[PDB]
C-alpha cells in the first residue's frame, strides 16, 4: 500500500 | 515472472490564486488500482480495480490520511523548491514522485525505487542500494541534506523491503485470476498503397495484456529496423492494450514480408502476412 508522507523537500 | 507496485505523485502549483493540486495514482504491473485527487469531491483514496474494493474501512482510512498529508505538504514543497531556484512566486511548477517495489521470481525484493522530478527533470533519487541519494544539482542537495538528517534513506528501505512487498503479494493473490493471467493479442494485417512503386503493410496487435510486446517485420529472415514504424503501445480502454507496426514495401513483392508478434500469452511467436 501507500508510503508515509515522509519529510518535506 | 517479475511483478511490481508503483505509485505516481504529481504536485502542481497554479497561480493566479488556485490552491496547489495533488494527484496520486497506484499500479500493480500494468493495472491501476487506486486514485486520489485533491480537486475531487470525495477527498479519499478511491478504488480503481475490483480486487482492492474488498478492503476494510481501516485500509482506506490510512490511505486517505497519507493522501491528505501529501496534499498539505505539497504547497510547502513547491514553495521550498521555488526558493532553491530563485523562481518567482508567480509561475507554475511541478513536483513528481515515483516509488515502489519489484518482486522477483524468488519472492524477494528485486529492486526498489524512490525518485522525484522538478518540472520534468530528474531532481533527487534513491540509489539501488536504498542507502544513499543522488541529487541532480546543488538545489536538490538542499533536499538531500534534509532527508539525510531525518534518516529517510532507511525507513524507505524498510517500507520497500516489507510493506511494499507484502502488500504487492497480497494484491497479486486477490486479483490472481486477472493480474496473473496473460491475454494473448488478437492479430491481423492491413495494406494501403502509398504510391505506385510502394505500399504500406501494417501489423495489428489488439486486446493484449500485459503491455510488454514485440512487433517486427521480416524480409529474407531479416528485421526491417529503420523502415518499421512502431507506434507507442496504447490502452484499449477495457484494461488491455493495442499496438501496430508499419513498413513501406515495393508493390507486388508484398509476400516477402512477414510480421512477427511476441507476447507472453503466446506459446510460439505469432507469424502472419497480408491476406487480400
Amino acid at each position: 500500500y501507500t508510503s508515509g508522507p515522509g519529510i518535506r523537500y | 515472472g517479475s511483478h511490481s507496485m508503483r505509485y505516481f505523485y504529481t504536485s502542481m502549483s497554479r497561480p493566479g490564486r488556485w490552491e496547489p493540486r495533488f494527484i496520486a495514482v497506484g499500479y500493480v504491473d500494468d493495472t491501476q488500482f487506486v486514485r486520489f485527487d485533491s480537486d475531487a469531491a470525495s477527498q479519499r483514496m478511491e478504488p480503481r480495480a475490483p480486487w482492492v474494493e474488498q478492503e476494510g474501512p481501516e485500509y482506506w482510512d490510512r490511505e486517505t490520511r497519507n493522501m491528505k498529508a501529501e496534499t498539505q505538504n505539497a504547497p510547502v514543497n513547491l514553495r521550498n523548491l521555488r526558493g532553491y531556484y530563485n523562481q518567482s512566486e508567480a509561475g507554475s511548477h511541478t513536483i513528481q514522485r515515483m516509488y515502489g517495489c519489484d518482486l522477483g521470481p524468488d519472492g524477494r525484493l528485486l529492486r526498489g525505487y524512490h525518485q522525484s522530478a522538478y518540472d520534468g527533470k530528474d531532481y533527487i533519487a534513491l540509489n539501488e542500494d536504498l542507502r544513499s541519494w543522488t541529487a541532480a544539482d546543488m538545489a536538490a542537495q538542499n533536499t538531500q541534506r534534509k532527508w539525510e538528517a531525518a534518516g529517510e534513506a532507511e525507513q524507505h528501505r524498510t517500507y520497500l523491503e516489507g510493506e511494499c512487498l507484502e502488500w504487492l503479494r497480497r494484491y497479486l493473490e486477490n486479483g490472481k485470476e486477472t493480474l496473473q493471467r496473460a491475454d494473448p493479442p488478437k492479430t491481423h494485417v492491413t495494406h494501403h498503397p502509398v504510391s505506385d512503386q510502394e505500399a504500406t503493410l501494417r501489423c495489428w496487435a489488439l486486446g493484449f495484456y500485459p503491455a510488454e510486446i514485440t512487433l517486427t517485420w521480416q524480409r529474407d529472415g531479416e528485421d526491417q529496423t529503420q523502415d518499421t514504424e512502431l507506434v507507442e503501445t496504447r490502452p484499449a480502454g477495457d484494461g488491455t492494450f493495442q499496438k501496430w507496426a508499419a513498413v513501406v514495401v515495393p508493390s507486388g513483392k508484398e509476400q516477402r514480408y512477414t510480421c512477427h508478434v511476441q507476447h507472453e500469452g503466446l506459446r510460439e511467436p505469432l507469424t502472419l502476412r497480408w491476406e487480400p
Binding site: - | 499500479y27 515515483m98 527533470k121 492491413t190 494501403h192 507507442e232 480502454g237
Partner: protein
Amino acid sequence: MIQRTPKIQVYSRHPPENGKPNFLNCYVSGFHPSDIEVDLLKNGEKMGKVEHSDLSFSKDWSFYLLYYTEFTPNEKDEYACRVNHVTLSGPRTVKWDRDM
C-alpha cells in the same frame, strides 16, 4: 524550464463496425506540463460527454491521459480529436482513421 509536446492517437476500443456501439479513444502522451485540452469531435462538433483516465506519467516524467467517450461508427460520420497544449501553436486536430 523545458516543455514537452503532446503525442496524439485516435482510435476505437474495439474494431470499428457500422451500427455497432463502441468507444472513441484519444490517447495523449509525452507532454509536459500536465495541463492539456482534449476534445472528441463528431463532424467538427464538440462531442457528447468525454471522460479521461487519472493523471499518470512515464519513466521519463512525461504525462499520459486517455480521453474516451461512447460512439457508434457511422458511414456518413467523421470523428477526430482536438488537442491543445502550451507547447502547440494552436489546437491540433487529428482525424480518426478506421485503419490506424
